[PDB]
Design a protein around this ligand. Structure first.
Ligand SMILES: [Ca+2]
Ligand SMILES: [Ca+2]
Ligand SMILES: [Cl-]
Lengths: 588, 588
């Protein structure tokens, strides 16, 4: 066995409380290097006859990435205290992996050798709002969804969908237009809406905020926003707004004061200023979002700033009853602020979903004291590389999915915001080079994956476009221009997801087929039901062997409803080019 | 390249801010497997400025443990933001290590593959009080230091130091006794005193608290405590008290109420009770420290309990100006409480040192939002196994020290509470089998090691005893029963530590000798200042070669003060059994 590939450390994704009485422990080792692994565990103070009392529990291999095998075990400490280790077996070789290193047999003269999970506290438990787990989100960029009130449209607004958008063009989309098209979303099966910024700002995207306490006049007023939220609630749709707390806009009052009065302004500490007076040339002498002068970075360490943003955060919840806050550039704002943010938000309305925009590994923000989840862009990356660009094999895709999922605790993955694109990415149909068959596969995977998926407006009807701003075209309402095949496909999958719990909250496992290149086979299971998905990611028909025992095993096609029994101990599934099939499994 | 042994993840000991402008990045690889490592780095938004290529910085190997090599690099992001990857060079091939995996060359496209350190926030920076770095602590168990007030000694106190202590014996030690012997401590060189529990409790150790707002009558009164602290402060000695917040005592009023009234008690939720009425056996029906009935666990999640404990924490600081809080069984209290604890204590007195009693890996409590340090028992175990028990080689000792040190960020190690024993361990002289020569080596290593070391009362004069209660004998004040040589050795070493910054704040590196079984050679470095230490851990004379080069190099024997020029390529030093020598290395 290779000791250099064995790893565990008491925190993050390797050791965490799943609930008030249960702990989850993981261990990773070199793939196929270990035959069996057992968790050695016991209460730190449980002694009898002068010997430490501990037991052995076999661990299950939950999956593996390109380099490692991941092992899992759940344990309910008798007194909520635990000292543990790992015993690995390979042939006649045995290793005991502990915090103090490796041993060849279990040392029991003391507990100091072992890893420790001191005490399971309910207060430190990671707990996201349960309702998001069954939710399917729909992201809307307000300036481009629907012009429901022409009288408030920006002057210079272009005819709807008359031309591709630019960084400064306006088409007159507003909040009323969203209200007017809610039945379209209900029919689709959407139960959650995520809106990009809607507070006063001069731009079409509004990430350069002028006033966080005012709805942009071009989008509507507070009365209209309230009606929108109330109407969504009546129809069973939760609403999440965009919080741009990392930076403000050039027209933000406090910034204007500092821009004019420099170091004597009482708002100078509200920002990250390097020298006075402020300037934008040759470059800004203050921190900004990226290198954008009109987006001054806010000092969230300043008491007055924190008070203001926390007031903003609770105001919209208290007065408008929103259901979530999507945090713009969340990773660039300090942890101290995010902890206070959670405390005040959750104290007001525990149901509010706290979603951070972080495109990379976000474990530091997912320990339970800050966010409920992050926009899962790493998932986006992997799914697009396999289904859209076909850059990696099915084997490599499974490895990447196993890699990212095992990088986090199970309860964290259960609340993950799994998207395929957004206002900050190219359109999936375009990433797919215009092949609807590939887009159908993207939706199939997304909608059968555990978590809280989000659909970018227009992707369900085949809208096209490159990256920002090309991906922000006016929503296509003309039924003659909407791709009917895709819309029906999405509606169908969302319905299925709502009907099968394993798709929404189950564990995922990948089965290795003969052709580990184009055939993807995976299962979703929650202990009560099991759904098998088989995908032929190739332009040729395929006969794919399904690795499952045929003893008393019955399958039910979820799309056609057809029931049939297996027998060949490995039934053969025949699929047309880019075809796919889903089966509910029955063991009688 | 063994990909399975390579590792980095943007947090804890692998990625952190060292100061407001500097980031530290670490990478671990299979020992001797990698020849060189380069850090590819840049600002995440460099692309906006047309800067698509990374900057490159070579990483330095800071040490190796049993299985890995550790690489290091410090970076000052121009805009406090960083995106990075690693380039590893091996005879086999060159590989780029990123968050998305390994690549043979730096990806030429614009996809996000890299690790990220979003923003360097001063507010999230780990920062312990600077003064602790130059402090040498002395731990005192009040019931056994000195009987300065016979009139308040417990009834039935045994003649001072006349017999071995027991779990229930009393000798009459008190706070006045400490005051009476301050000059002894000043002479020794001590600049910090850590006292075990001193609040009212029926026991001789007092970890079963009866009243947190009262100094035990047998130890003295609030007036005596003030005198002690003021005299200490006048002598440049800081004072740290023991906070027993995980559990209270059997005589704690709130608990007595619950034990009497049961479920009808208004204090029922102040503890962890499973059933009523409360029972103490076979095992308590309520959570306790270990299974001690007289030590019921407090519910630090209960608002009243938190307020009471926080009031306690701030009371002694505000009223008596203490300089630190040592947290008893700190790992068994929730993180939420520790965050509030830090906020309140630091707001009151930023200089207060927060030390948690955690014997295992404490990374989760050392990210900057909770403790400043923990009692470094893992250091204690490693040092004892080498110098005292001689159960491991000099090579294995070097590996273990590198292992535990690289497990934490540099600024965390710089404030670490490095002890060799305490009231919860056997006496070091006894662990050394009565060999004073070995104890001298223990003090030598401890006092030349970076951090905030602590000396257990009596160890500086050779007191003996097994583990609790044996290690709690009355302090020996008669010089005829004190080991003068050892005492002067400790006094001399504390003097040197104060004179050479590299000993208390420098980096450490182990130089591997030919006979790396008994010969230990290491150096402390801080800028150009270097202290070389050579230890002969064997019971026979030895001639050990000093690897150092003579290139305009001069050595200063820190024990004798003797100066001399370096011979040729390697100077040889003759040492007696368990001998040692320290040399300041000057580069001219
Ligand atoms: Ca309009
Ligand atoms: Ca006394
Ligand atoms: Cl309405």
């Amino acid at each position: 066995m290779r000791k250099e590939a064995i790893y565990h450390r008491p925190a993050d994704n390797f050791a965490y409380a799943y609930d008030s009485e249960t702990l989850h422990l993981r261990l990773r080792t070199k793939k196929d290097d270990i035959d069996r692994v057992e968790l050695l565990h016991g209460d730190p103070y449980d002694w009898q006859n002068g010997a430490w009392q501990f037991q052995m529990m076999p661990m299950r291999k939950t999956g593996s990435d390109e380099l490692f095998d991941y092992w899992f075990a759940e344990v309910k400490p008798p007194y909520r205290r635990l000292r543990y280790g790992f015993v690995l077996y390979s042939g006649e070789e045995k290793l005991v992996y502990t915090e103090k290193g490796f041993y060849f047999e279990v040392p029991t003269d003391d507990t100091a050798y072992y890893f420790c999970f001191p005490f399971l506290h309910r207060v430190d438990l990671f707990e996201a709002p349960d309702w998001v787990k069954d939710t399917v989100w729909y992201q809307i960029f307000p300036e481009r969804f629907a012009n429901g009130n022409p009288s408030i449209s920006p002057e210079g607004s272009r005819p709807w969908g008359s031309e591709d958008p630019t960084p400064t063009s306006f088409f007159g989309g507003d909040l009323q237009g969203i209200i007017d098209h809610l039945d379209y979303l209900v029919d689709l099966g959407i139960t959650g809406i995520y809106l990009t910024p809607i507070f006063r700002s001069p731009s079409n995207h509004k990430y350069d905020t002028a006033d966080y306490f005012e709805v942009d006049p071009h989008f509507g007023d507070k009365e209209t926003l309230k009606t929108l939220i109330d109407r969504c609630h009546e129809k069973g749709i939760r609403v999440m707004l965009d919080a741009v707390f990392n930076h403000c806009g050039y027209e933000f009052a406090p910034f204007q004061d500092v821009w004019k009065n420099g170091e004597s302004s009482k708002y100078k500490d509200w920002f990250h200023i390097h020298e006075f007076p402020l300037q934008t040339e040759p470059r800004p002498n203050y921190d900004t979002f990226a290198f954008v002068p009109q987006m001054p970075k806010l000092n969230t360490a300043n008491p007055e700033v924190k008070r203001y943003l926390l007031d903003v955060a609770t105001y919209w919840i208290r007065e408008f009853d929103i259901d979530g806050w999507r945090l713009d550039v969340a990773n660039e704002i300090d942890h101290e602020f995010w902890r206070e943010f959670r405390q005040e938000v959750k104290a007001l309305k525990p149901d509010v979903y706290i979603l951070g925009e972080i495109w990379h590994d976000a474990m530091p923000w997912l320990r339970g004291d800050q966010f409920d989840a992050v926009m899962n862009y790493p998932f986006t990356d992997g799914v697009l590389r396999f289904f859209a660009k076909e850059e990696i094999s099915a084997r490599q895709f499974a490895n990447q999915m196993m890699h990212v999922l095992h990088s986090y605790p199970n309860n964290v993955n259960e609340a993950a915001f799994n998207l395929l694109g957004s206002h900050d990415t190219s359109r999936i149909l375009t990433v797919c080079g215009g092949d609807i068959r590939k887009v159908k596969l993207l939706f199939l995977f997304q909608l059968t994956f555990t978590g809280s998926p989000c659909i970018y407006y227009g992707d369900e009807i085949g809208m096209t476009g490159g990256n920002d701003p090309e991906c922000r075209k006016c929503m296509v309402w003309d039924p003659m221009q909407q791709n009917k095949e895709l819309h029906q496909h999405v509606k169908q999958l969302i319905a299925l997801r709502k009907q099968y719990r394993s798709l929404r909250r189950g564990e995922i496992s990948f089965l290795h087929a003969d052709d580990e290149m184009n055939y993807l086979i995976y299962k979703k299971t929650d202990g009560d039901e099991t759904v098998l998905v088989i995908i032929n990611r190739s332009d040729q028909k395929a006969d794919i062997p399904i690795p499952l025992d045929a003893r008393g095993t019955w399958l039910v096609n979820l799309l056609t409803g057809e029931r049939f029994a297996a027998e060949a101990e490995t039934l053969c599934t025949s699929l047309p080019p880019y075809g796919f099939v889903l089966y509910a499994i029955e063991h009688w």
